[PDB]
Design a protein around this ligand. Structure first.
Ligand SMILES: CN(C)[C@H]1CC[C@H](Oc2ncnc3ccc([N+](=O)[O-])cc23)CC1
Length: 286
């Protein structure tokens, strides 16, 4: 698949000169979304998201990786790239606008949005698993699966984003990702699709609980420690269910928790593959 080459001056125009002010006050900055700031804009009546990136060469290599992965990978559960603008050091990626922001923002009810229902949460978990399955089937490792990288469209369909660190068991000298979601082997430099499964297991715990992966003012500060508290029978998954829901039944919650627990196996080889995760999430609803 081939993309439209946008002019930098056309992108600067539609985003009102990359205004750093918020949307409510009058600007276009949505906030930031990964080694770059994201801006709302309108191209030919179409609402778009423009990610201005943002060593300079490492950032250009992430820009190229995103475009290469997006050219090869088009799926219902991946964000859609429309085009880009290279033109010097200010690199821009243009996407279809995702009006419901990220799953992290919706789980924390950022800016006063209503809590996501259990029904919406089950659909989002299944959609995100379908997107990771598509990447794995096409021999790609995302390397940064987290709720901030699961975007939500006009119908709350899950859309995986941020493919700058994606790769087609190998080791690396540059350890990348988000600590609170990373598998133990990924924190040691290993590169494998099994690390994406582990990180997805952390996302499933954020969905069940509404709690972020890391909270500096919390005990435990890391969400993955709750798997040990439950396994030692000190507590149960019902004690951690997000209280901002009225439609969560304990049977399907325990079925989603069982998938998350399996994803979070410390031994990479004992985790299920994405196809099994996808099958288990379908059986939960059905
Ligand atoms: C913190 N929070 C307000 C974030 C919510 C999500 C915002 O990002 C985005 N918002 C809307 N559409 C997007 C389309 C593509 C990408 N992308 O990067 O592929 C990011 C997008 C960035 C701010």
């Amino acid at each position: 698949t081939r993309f439209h080459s946008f002019s930098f001056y056309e992108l600067k125009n539609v985003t009102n000169n990359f205004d750093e002010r918020p949307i409510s006050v009058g600007g276009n900055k949505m906030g930031e979304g990964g080694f770059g700031v994201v801006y709302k804009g309108y191209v030919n009546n179409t609402t778009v998201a423009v990610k201005k990136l943002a060593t300079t060469e490492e950032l250009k290599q992430q820009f190229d990786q995103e475009i290469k992965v997006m050219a090869k990978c088009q799926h219902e559960n991946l964000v859609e790239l429309l085009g880009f603008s290279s033109d010097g050091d200010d690199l821009c990626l243009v996407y279809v606008y995702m009006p419901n922001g990220s799953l992290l923002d919706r789980l924390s009810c950022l800016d006063g949005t209503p809590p996501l229902s259990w029904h919406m949460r089950c659909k989002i978990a299944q959609g995100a698993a379908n997107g990771i399955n598509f990447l794995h089937e096409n021999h790609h490792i995302h390397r940064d699966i987290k709720s901030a990288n699961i975007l939500l469209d006009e119908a709350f369909t899950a859309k995986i984003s941020d493919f700058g660190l994606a790769r087609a068991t190998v080791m690396t000298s540059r350890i990348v990702g988000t600590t609170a979601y990373m598998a133990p082997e990924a924190l040691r430099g290993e590169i494998t699709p099994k690390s994406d499964i582990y990180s997805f297991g952390v996302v499933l715990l954020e969905i069940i609980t509404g709690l972020p992966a890391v909270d500096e003012h919390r005990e435990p500060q890391l969400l993955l420690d709750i798997k040990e508290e439950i396994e030692d029978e000190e507590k149960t998954i019902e004690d951690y269910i997000d209280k901002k829901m009225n439609d969560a039944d304990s049977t399907s919650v325990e079925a989603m928790y069982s998938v998350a627990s399996q994803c979070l196996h410390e031994k990479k080889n004992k985790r299920p593959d994405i196809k099994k995760v996808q099958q288990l999430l379908q059986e939960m609803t059905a």
